[PDB]
Amino acid sequence: PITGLVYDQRMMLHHNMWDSHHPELPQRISRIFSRHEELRLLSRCHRIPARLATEEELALCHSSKHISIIKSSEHMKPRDLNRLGDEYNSIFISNESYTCALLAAGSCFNSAQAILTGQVRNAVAIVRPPGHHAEKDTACGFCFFNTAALTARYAQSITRESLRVLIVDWDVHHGNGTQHIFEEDDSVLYISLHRYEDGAFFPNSEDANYDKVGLGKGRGYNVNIPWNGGKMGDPEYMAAFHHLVMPIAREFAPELVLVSAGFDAARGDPLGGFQVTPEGYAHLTHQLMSLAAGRVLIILEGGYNLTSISESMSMCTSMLLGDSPPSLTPLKTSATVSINNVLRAHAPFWSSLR
Ligand SMILES: CN1CCc2c(c3ccccc3n2Cc2ccc(C(=O)NO)cc2)C1
Ligand SMILES: [K+]
Ligand SMILES: [K+]
Ligand SMILES: [K+]
Ligand code: NA
Ligand SMILES: [Zn+2]
């Protein structure tokens, strides 16, 4: 009946030397950590130490070439960091980036280990840079290595290959890297909710549409819930959880739940354009706690309004600690259309949807 928390100020060292106001700020993690202190949540958690991921652990999901290229940035001059970062879609690199990415992943491995060895019931990881856009062979969208995907494979490496891991990705963006890593895998159920706008929203691929249901033995094990038609908020997220996320998750019966917990769908986020409230995130967390005997690890992804992310992630930790959920309209038409499209796509695979 204990909640773990991992945070290490060393992850602040990754920075954008050309644009100090770039939204993926060092202060994202320190602001969230400070809010946990202010709300007296930190003293209620068991502190789990950060560690570096090893290169062998990175190789659970990533190619040796990709690992070595990112590692090579540790001693690069500015011009070379710029050139390397520009090889990718939406990446900046500093000499500290590789270490920080290692720390984000190893923090999550230690948290998964703490849950699976029974030291804690659940945990929260206040980490950066984020992970879910990183692919086997490339960095993308602020992400170097796919922390959540690696954590699922790490968990399987200390239990069994077929350990059932649910990844719920509520960052406003599609976790293209996570989808691809697990596309043929029935051991890892990936469920993403994301703004899509028929491909107009980053990362601008039809891979994020509802008809991408998985491949081969993984068919049915990839659930994309794509939003179209502008601002969505608590009503739409609650409805998606009620009709899709929770029924599928219960049927899958995960043994571990990882949350790719971006807070860029939050009210106030300049990039997401959505209105999910801190109370909304608390309710989503509380629902997920009903799965996997409560074995839930919340991993920070995106989220760029410092006040919004600090309040939102803190509310999630309050839920993990067992606090009562806070008090919480009809859906937008396009949201009903999205949910129905996903229901039709997934009813062949999940009896709970029929
Ligand atoms: C072109 N628009 C979409 C893409 C984009 C925009 C943007 C603005 C500032 C910095 C990065 C930006 N990016 C790249 C970008 C990449 C990843 C993420 C992300 O990881 N969000 O959680 C957020 C933004 C605006
Ligand atoms: K998502
Ligand atoms: K999958
Ligand atoms: K289909
Ligand atoms: Na260890
Ligand atoms: Zn995002």
What spacing in Å lies between the alpha carbon of 270 and ligand 1's midpoint?
10
Atom of ligand 1 nearest to the CA of 303: 22
The candidate with the shortest Cα–Cα distance to 319, out of 41, 56, 20, 43, is 41
CB atoms within 10 A of CB 211: 11
348: Cα separation from own chain's centroid: 27
Tokens 């992804």 belong to residue: 301
The partner residues of 225 in beta bridges, in order of sequence, read: 193
Rounded Cα distance between 235 and 338, Å, is 14
Rounded Cα distance between 104 and 50, Å, is 8
For residue 107, give the ligand nearest its CA: 5
Question: What residue's CA is closest to ligand 1, atom 8?
Answer: 271
Task: Spell out the domain ranges in the chain.
Answer: 1-354
158 contacts: CB under 8 Å, gap ≥ 6: 113, 116
For residue 165, give the ligand nearest its CA: 3
What spacing in Å lies between the alpha carbon of 26 and ligand 1's midpoint?
16
Encoded tokens for 341: 């499209």
CB 279 within 8 A of CB 189: no
> Of the residues 14, 15, 132, 133, which is catalytic?
133
The pick from 171, 271, 274, 300 for probing ligand 1's pocket by mutation, whose C-beta has the most ligand atoms within 8 angstroms, reads 271
The candidate with the shortest Cα–Cα distance to 192, out of 204, 211, 176, is 176
Vertex 103, ends 164 and 113: CA angle to 5°? 35
What spacing in Å lies between the alpha carbon of 13 and ligand 5's midpoint?
23
Rounded Cα distance between 65 and 69, Å, is 6
Q: Which residues surround ligand 6, an ion (CB under 5 A)?
A: 171, 173, 262, 264, 302
The candidate with the shortest Cα–Cα distance to 313, out of 50, 128, 139, is 128
This PDB structure is determined at a resolution in Å of 1.1
Biggest CA-to-CA distance, the chain: 58
How determined? X-ray
- Strand runs (DSSP E) across the chain, as ranges? 3-7, 46-47, 122-126, 165-169, 188-195, 222-227, 256-261, 296-300
| Spatial strand order in the sheet of 122-126 | 46-47, 3-7, 122-126, 296-300, 256-261, 165-169, 188-195, 222-227
Cis amide linkage into residue 78, ω under 30° from 0: no
Tokens 């697990």 belong to residue: 182
Question: What residue's CA is closest to ligand 1, atom 7?
Answer: 271
Rounded Cα distance between 85 and 224, Å, is 29
Torsional sign, CA 26, 31, 33, 34: positive
Buried b (16+ CB within 10 A) or exposed e, 2-26: ebbbbbbeebbebbbeeeeeebbbb
For residue 143, give the ligand nearest its CA: 1
Rounded Cα distance between 104 and 108, Å, is 7
The candidate with the shortest Cα–Cα distance to 145, out of 54, 50, 271, 22, is 54
Q: Is 233 helix (H, G, I), strand (E, B) or coil?
A: strand
The candidate with the shortest Cα–Cα distance to 38, out of 310, 220, 350, is 310
Question: What residue's CA is closest to ligand 1, atom 16?
Answer: 141
CB 286 within 8 A of CB 296: no
| Residues 207/208/209/210 CA torsion (nearest 10 deg) | 110
The candidate with the shortest Cα–Cα distance to 202, out of 234, 245, 171, is 171
Atom of ligand 1 nearest to the CA of 171: 22
Cis amide linkage into residue 254, ω under 30° from 0: no
Rounded Cα distance between 310 and 27, Å, is 10
The candidate with the shortest Cα–Cα distance to 258, out of 52, 139, 112, is 112
Encoded tokens for 7: 């945070």
Encoded tokens for 25: 């700020």
Question: What residue's CA is closest to ligand 1, atom 3?
Answer: 202
Q: What are phi and psi of 261, to 5 degrees?
A: -100, 75
What spacing in Å lies between the alpha carbon of 192 and ligand 3's midpoint?
11
CB 148 within 8 A of CB 53: no
The candidate with the shortest Cα–Cα distance to 32, out of 296, 315, 253, 255, is 315
7 contacts: CB under 8 Å, gap ≥ 6: 29, 32, 33, 50, 126, 127
According to CATH, the superfamily of the domain at 1-354 is Histone deacetylase domain (3.40.800.20)
Q: Which residue ranges have their beta carbon within 6 Å of ligand 1?
A: 22-23, 90, 130, 133, 141-142, 171, 173, 202, 262, 264, 271, 301-302
CB < 8 Å & 24+ apart, contacts of 337-342? 337/228, 338/210, 338/225, 338/226, 338/227, 338/228, 339/225, 339/239, 339/240, 339/243, 339/244, 341/210, 342/210, 342/223, 342/224, 342/225, 342/244
Known active-site residue 133: yes
38 contacts: CB under 8 Å, gap ≥ 6: none
Atom of ligand 1 nearest to the CA of 23: 10
Amino acid occupying residue 99: T
User: How far apart, in Å, are the Cα atoms of 47 and each of 9, 99, 203?
Assistant: 14, 21, 35
Question: What residue's CA is closest to ligand 1, atom 14?
Answer: 90
- Kind plus residue range of the DSSP H or E element containing 98: helix 97-116
